[PDB]
Amino acid sequence: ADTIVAVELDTYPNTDIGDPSYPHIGIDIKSVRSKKTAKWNMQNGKVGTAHIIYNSVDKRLSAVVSYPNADSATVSYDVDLDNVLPEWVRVGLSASTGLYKETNTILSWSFTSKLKSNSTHETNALHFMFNQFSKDQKDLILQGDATTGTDGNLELTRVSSNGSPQGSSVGRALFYAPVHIWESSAVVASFEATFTFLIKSPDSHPADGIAFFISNIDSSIPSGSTGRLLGLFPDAN
Amino acid sequence: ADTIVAVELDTYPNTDIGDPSYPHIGIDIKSVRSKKTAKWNMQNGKVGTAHIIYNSVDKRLSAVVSYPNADSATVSYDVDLDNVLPEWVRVGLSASTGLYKETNTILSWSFTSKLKSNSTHETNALHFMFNQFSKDQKDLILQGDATTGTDGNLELTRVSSNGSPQGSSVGRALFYAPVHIWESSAVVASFEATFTFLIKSPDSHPADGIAFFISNIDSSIPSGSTGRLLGLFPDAN
Numbered sequence A, B: 001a002d003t004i005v006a007v008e009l010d011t012y013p014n015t016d017i018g019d020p021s022y023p024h025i026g027i028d029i030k031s032v033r034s035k036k037t038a039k040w041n042m043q044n045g046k047v048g049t050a051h052i053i054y055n056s057v058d059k060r061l062s063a064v065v066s067y068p069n070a071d072s073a074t075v076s077y078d079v080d081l082d083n084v085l086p087e088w089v090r091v092g093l094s095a096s097t098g099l100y101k102e103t104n105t106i107l108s109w110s111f112t113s114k115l116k117s118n119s120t121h122e123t124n125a126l127h128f129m130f131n132q133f134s135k136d137q138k139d140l141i142l143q144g145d146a147t148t149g150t151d152g153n154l155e156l157t158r159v160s161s162n163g164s165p166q167g168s169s170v171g172r173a174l175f176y177a178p179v180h181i182w183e184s185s186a187v188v189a190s191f192e193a194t195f196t197f198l199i200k201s202p203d204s205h206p207a208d209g210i211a212f213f214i215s216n217i218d219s220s221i222p223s224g225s226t227g228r229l230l231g232l233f234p235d236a237n
């Protein structure tokens, strides 16, 4: 199995495998059984503002989500990125659904690592600002059944049947280039994200949520994940 | 051949194929016959500072080289990056030598693309700061006989014979990810580079220089370049 750490912007309450009763933001270490959860609003088709950092000066993997005219859901978990996440990685997005529909329109995405040559000595970056998901974007090795383009969009579904996006489809959005992390050159790489999304109400109880992972340099769609596995865990444990 | 535009920091005056009678800095549009030239001091092992930009509001393609306590060589050339270099690229470094030895140590490298989604609408980046070329850097697809590591160094020769780097050595340093250019969405992708080299005096009339190219997404070392072909040209025209 692939070593993986996700941040769940879940929309489906998975009571059986361990999610709380409401649509929530959370955080995952190698299991769908999250470490912390928090209250998330889950409005209809509106837009976007999510934000995930990790400063090893403070070792908090902090995360907030805001609609404009909404709150900020802090779901920060104490995790040491020393021993949990590989020496070189492959970041990306992940959405999925199964037996229920939701729209998972991503419209922009970013990153910024800053990793410690000699702590002051000019930390290495990988900053990008993808406001322009093209039709033929090629620094993504997008897996599953994700699509892109036709507008500035990264559709992590099988879509365009009036955008009621054809339940039990999964597509991930793995960015091309790796990042050195594990510790080894210690682990102050304050990796940021901004994750402007759009979850349209399908008039069908919108459910399964979008994620944000940092996986191994290899991955796949693990063992079939058309549903509760959130696109990236092979098993529900 | 493969379409490629480089900045030759040539250190042998290739007297028969277009370069001047002095070791210069040039700029190459598909031809080792250059488009500008500029006088270079050729100091011994001292560090580095070279810097290459291209906006498309002013359409000049520029470069300078100054050692600290030395002067700069503005070898800027006006060329239309619209029709000369493909949409998706693979940036990086190229050095070579043949029958003459020199040091081609690179210690740091950076970049910043900014390509015009809708000019103010939050253009896309790929910025990095590689001050710390490690032993197992894996967003580099370094071709030829390039080495790295053992220290923070990128060694584009075959090295460690007391830094007498084993002539007829060629090494390339192709970065991993692609960038949109050609024009199409227009071409103001103001790509920067920092090119901090080290050319140690090997006490051996040091001569062939490092380049900085921008190529197609596919490449190799073309038809042998152990010498004046400068690592990226198949042909001397």
Ligand SMILES: *[C@@H]1O[C@H](CO)[C@@H](O[C@@H]2O[C@H](CO)[C@@H](O[C@@H]3O[C@H](CO[C@H]4O[C@H](CO)[C@@H](O)[C@H](O)[C@@H]4O[C@@H]4O[C@H](CO)[C@@H](O[C@@H]5O[C@H](CO)[C@H](O)[C@H](O)[C@H]5O)[C@H](O)[C@H]4NC(C)=O)[C@@H](O)[C@H](O[C@H]4O[C@H](CO)[C@@H](O)[C@H](O)[C@@H]4O)[C@@H]3O)[C@H](O)[C@H]2NC(C)=O)[C@H](O)[C@H]1NC(C)=O
Residues within 6 Å of the ligand: B012, B014, B097, B098, B099, B100, B204, B205, B226, B227, B228, B229
């Ligand atoms: C039949 O016709 C053909 C052609 O018409 C002739 O065949 C050969 O053609 C070759 C064409 O490529 C050509 O080779 C190139 O020569 C140039 C010029 O350099 C040398 O040219 C002659 C070759 O003998 C001579 O005039 C010189 O020997 C000259 O070489 C210089 O020699 C110095 C002392 O020997 C030498 O000092 C050396 O220093 C180093 C360290 O610094 C050593 O360790 C040692 O201590 C010393 O020997 C000089 O450095 C040396 N060079 C110079 C510039 O003065 C040459 O530019 C080219 O080499 C280039 O190619 C590589 C490829 O990447 C590139 O990196 C450089 O640009 C490099 O300069 C070729 O060598 C020959 O002229 C020719 N061969 C001969 C023997 O003449 C035939 O001659 C014709 N037959 C008949 C019967 O006429």
Ligand SMILES: *[C@@H]1O[C@H](CO)[C@@H](O[C@@H]2O[C@H](CO)[C@@H](O[C@@H]3O[C@H](CO[C@H]4O[C@H](CO)[C@@H](O)[C@H](O)[C@@H]4O[C@@H]4O[C@H](CO)[C@@H](O[C@@H]5O[C@H](CO)[C@H](O)[C@H](O)[C@H]5O)[C@H](O)[C@H]4NC(C)=O)[C@@H](O)[C@H](O[C@H]4O[C@H](CO)[C@@H](O)[C@H](O)[C@@H]4O)[C@@H]3O)[C@H](O)[C@H]2NC(C)=O)[C@H](O)[C@H]1NC(C)=O
Residues within 6 Å of the ligand: B031, B237
């Ligand atoms: C083995 O021993 C033999 C001795 O017998 C020697 O080998 C060869 O022998 C051949 C016959 O004996 C003979 O071959 C000659 O080749 C040259 C090569 O042409 C270029 O090089 C010249 C060097 O002096 C230049 O002066 C020329 O101008 C010529 O350049 C041409 O013009 C353009 C650039 O100037 C270029 O256009 C480019 O094309 C690219 C393509 O993509 C770009 O888009 C853009 O359009 C341009 O940049 C042309 O392509 C280019 N032509 C080429 C590369 O072929 C040839 O010129 C020559 O013809 C004349 O040569 C002299 C004048 O130069 C004249 O006196 C003759 O009578 C003849 O008319 C021959 O075909 C050579 O003797 C030799 N070849 C050598 C040495 O290179 C060698 O000594 C030994 N070794 C080998 C490996 O053979």
Ligand SMILES: CC(=O)N[C@H]1[C@@H]2OC[C@H]3O[C@H](O[C@@H]4[C@H](O)[C@H](O[C@@H]([C@@H]1O)[C@@H](CO)O2)O[C@H](CO[C@H]1O[C@H](CO)[C@@H](O)[C@H](O)[C@@H]1O[C@@H]1O[C@H](CO)[C@@H](O)[C@H](O)[C@H]1NC(C)=O)[C@H]4O)[C@@H](O[C@@H]1O[C@H](CO)[C@@H](O)[C@H](O)[C@H]1NC(C)=O)[C@@H](O)[C@@H]3O
Residues within 6 Å of the ligand: A016, A098, A099, A100, A226, A227, A228
């Ligand atoms: C076939 C059967 O007997 N199913 C049982 C179920 O057995 C396994 C199934 O698990 C999922 O089934 C869903 C629920 O778990 C639920 O309860 C039963 C179900 O009958 C459970 C345990 O009791 O065991 O049934 C819902 C259907 O919704 C009705 O039940 C609700 C109770 O949770 C309750 O709100 C209502 O009775 C509701 O009826 C509708 O709602 C209102 C509210 O009262 C009524 O007034 C309406 O008239 C009525 N109709 C409508 C149209 O509103 C069932 O969905 C299921 O597993 C899901 O798989 C999906 C794929 O990812 C995903 O959604 C999620 O992972 C799973 N959901 C879970 C576990 O809850 C199936 O695999 C199994 O059939």
Ligand SMILES: [Ca+2]
Residues within 6 Å of the ligand: A012, A014, A208, A227, A228, A229, A230
């Ligand atoms: Ca789930």
Ligand SMILES: [Ca+2]
Residues within 6 Å of the ligand: B010, B011, B012, B013, B014, B207, B208, B228
């Ligand atoms: Ca030369």
Ligand SMILES: [Zn+2]
Residues within 6 Å of the ligand: A008, A010, A012, A014, A019, A024, A026, A034
């Ligand atoms: Zn969840």
Ligand SMILES: [Zn+2]
Residues within 6 Å of the ligand: B008, B010, B014, B019, B026, B034
């Ligand atoms: Zn030159």
